[PDB]
């Protein structure tokens, strides 16, 4: 195409981060570029120091089936979820020093799939009870509820502008919801299977979805159409994690095939391969400035690729 | 910097949790699976009382520290959270043994075999065979003659060829037929016979998990 190729990028793990005892499901990066959160099914939500290869905190979870991680933009709180229906908010920066639970957000009737810290005191959670919900920390109740999906919602993407979020469901619908008015702005039903993972543009104009048919489909807001799809014929394994670059040129996609197939914005070529994991790549993220790339898989191994 | 001393010993804290999770590695993901009105909670409180949302039950004992994972309720798509449970030593499952002839709780209420056929379809859809060893549990056997007697069994069941209209023997043949509807014979389905109020359920699950640990130890120690 018109855009210049990025080429075959040889990407190496600078630092390997070991200490999770079981399969890692989700990770989230902190906004100050050295802090991340990542969680396993042992019952550990771990705050990791990136550049110097350390655990900042080790948070035991009463919910041992956690599927989500959220890290606050301020850096004071983290959010875990899971099969026990409750979004548990833990305070990192306390006088107490231990990372202790502040509020247990109960009320959901399904497994919590992806939560994201909307603000310092506002949390948006996607769940397996077909509904999404924005909650307030101090009240402990749903500020607003996002019903009306047909299938179970599996992923959630934080808006950088903190105004309009998008979530994807099992019934092949990617619905955008506005936080304030609470109603669905746009529906993307042009898909054949579940939305395993979702990630959203730094501008906010586009978002790519993870599927089970090796299609990293992008949908864009103002275009109102569903035409571009990132499909690799050789791969049949599904996309478990989706993450974006700062420029939006480079797409980070972790797969069921224990590899990270990394793509480009327009021409959609295999740009980079991050084959260093025994089991499927379950979670993948970048720092806000973009020095580090974190890949967690089910083999209890978390790797920084630079 | 000086963060090192905080973190390396935090390593062994997780290694302590590596030790304790190995100290409780007789626990695994004992995934109870079931349908509505099969009386799952009755057996759950039975196992709690005799040795005294997903809910985890610690059955800690000197012989075996034990923890049972109740996935009762949780109305959602099975496929997405069944990825979480690949490490199951046993997919514990309850079959509606007692209600031979009932219709589904959905508004139609006229289904012939489709309750049991739907349960069989949930039995079939198993995408992982690495460590799956279904521990089958039979339901109560308190009242037989009226329940067998009021509705004719043979017309509902297409392949059933057995004695009927007798109180005691037909119970044995219908139980042997239900435990003989095991489609996957390469693995071992560890069926047990227990009533709703019958005791010693913990010994049955303990023997079944010991036997499947023996089979996996035969497989991965090259001792097959």
């Amino acid at each position, epitope marked *: 195409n018109n855009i210049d190729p990025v080429g075959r990028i040889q990407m190496r793990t600078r630092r390997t981060l070991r200490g999770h005892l079981a399969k890692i499901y989700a990770m989230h990066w902190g906004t*100050d570029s*050295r*802090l991340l959160v990542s969680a396993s099914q042992d019952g550990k939500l771990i705050i990791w*120091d990136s550049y*110097t290869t*350390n655990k*900042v*905190h080790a948070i035991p979870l009463r919910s041992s089936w956690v599927m989500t991680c959220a890290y606050a933009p301020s*850096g004071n709180y983290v959010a875990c979820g899971g099969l026990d229906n409750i979004c548990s908010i833990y305070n990192l*920066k306390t*006088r*107490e*020093g*231990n990372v202790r639970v502040s509020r247990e957000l109960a009320g959901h009737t399904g497994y919590l799939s992806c939560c994201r810290f909307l603000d310092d005191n506002q949390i948006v959670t996607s769940s397996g009870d077909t509904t999404c919900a924005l909650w307030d920390i101090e009240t402990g109740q749903q500020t607003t509820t996002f019903t009306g999906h047909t299938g179970d919602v599996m992923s959630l993407s934080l808006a950088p502008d903190t105004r309009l979020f998008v979530s994807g469901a099992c019934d092949a619908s990617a619905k955008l919801w506005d936080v304030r008015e609470g109603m669905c702005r746009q529906t993307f039903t042009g898909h054949e299977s579940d939305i395993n993972a979702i990630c959203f543009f730094p501008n906010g104009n586009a978002f790519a979805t993870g599927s089970d048919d090796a299609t990293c489909r992008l949908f864009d807001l103002r275009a109102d159409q569903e035409l571009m799809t990132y499909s690799h014929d050789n791969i049949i394994c599904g996309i478990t994690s989706v993450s974006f670059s700062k420029s939006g040129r480079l797409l980070l996609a972790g797969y069921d095939d224990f590899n990270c197939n990394v793509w480009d914005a327009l021409k959609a070529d295999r740009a980079g391969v991050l084959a260093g994991h025994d089991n499927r790549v379950s979670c993948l993220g970048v720092t806000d400035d973009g020095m580090a790339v974190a890949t967690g898989s089910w083999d209890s191994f978390l790797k920084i690729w630079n | *910097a*000086e*963060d090192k*001393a*905080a973190v390396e*010993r935090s390593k062994m804290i997780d290694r302590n949790l590596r030790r304790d999770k190995r100290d409780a590695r007789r626990e695994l993901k004992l995934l109870l699976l079931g349908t509505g009105e099969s009386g799952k909670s009755t057996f759950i409180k039975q196992m709690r009382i005799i040795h005294g949302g997903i809910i985890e039950y610690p059955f800690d004992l000197q012989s075996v520290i034990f923890r049972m994972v109740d996935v009762g309720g949780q109305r959602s798509e099975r496929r997405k959270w069944i990825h979480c449970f690949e490490n199951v030593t046993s997919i514990m499952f309850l079959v509606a043994l007692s209600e031979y002839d009932q219709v589904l709780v959905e508004s139609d209420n006229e289904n012939r075999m489709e309750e049991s056929k739907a349960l069989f379809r949930t039995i079939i859809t198993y995408p992982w065979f690495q460590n799956s060893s279904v521990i089958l549990f039979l339901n109560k056997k308190d009242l037989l003659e009226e329940k067998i007697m009021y509705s004719h069994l043979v017309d509902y069941f297409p392949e059933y060829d057995g004695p009927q209209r007798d109180a005691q023997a037909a119970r044995e043949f219908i139980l042997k037929m239900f435990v003989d509807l095991n489609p996957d014979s390469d693995k071992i389905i560890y069926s047990h016979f227990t009533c709703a109020t019958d005791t010693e359920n913990i010994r049955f699950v303990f023997a079944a998990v010991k036997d499947t640990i023996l089979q996996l130890n035969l497989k991965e120690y090259n001792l097959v």
Partner: single-chain antibody
Amino acid sequence: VQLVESGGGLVQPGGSRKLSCSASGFAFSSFGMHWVRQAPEKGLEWVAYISSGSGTIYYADTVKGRFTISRDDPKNTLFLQMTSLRSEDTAMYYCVRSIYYYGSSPFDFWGQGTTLTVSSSDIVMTQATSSVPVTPGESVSISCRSSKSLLHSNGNTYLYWFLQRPGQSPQLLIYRMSNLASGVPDRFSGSGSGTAFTLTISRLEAEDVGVYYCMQHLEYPLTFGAGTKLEL
């Protein structure tokens, strides 16, 4: 919430004591303990450090071997055993709580302080002025100097400012020369070069007229200087 110290009294030079820092209201197991002590007229000077969980025990270079200390983690207590007590150790001992990670706030909360009155290579920091009279509402700048360029390759300066209100603990104000501490208002601001440092106190109010203190933290020994007193 509360840190209590004990072990004071009047002992002749050459005796033995047991200082005891009992702490409560925080997870003491994951915290590192410092033992800053203060001369009755000269400024603070550091004594000892223990990491979280009784690991890397540190000491000041001149009292290496002469002081011993343990920590009772299940009861959250510090046992500073005092051996061969000299006449130059008349001091107000403090029990300092710190934690070390990225984005942390070490030296954040301080102990109340117990007295100890007996009868009768190394980086050194220095102050600018021993006493400065300032009426409130003038945005006073207080500066300090050192003997090393505290611009270590990890990308941050290991400089910690302080303030001691007269009578109680010297609470933290500025850590890493640009990050505001917890419990202090949004009026202080730190700056400085690699070696020289400064601190701007804008729109002064009541009770922020105690003696100020500065800290290098790049190496294991810790030096304070005489401490800049602020007057009216």
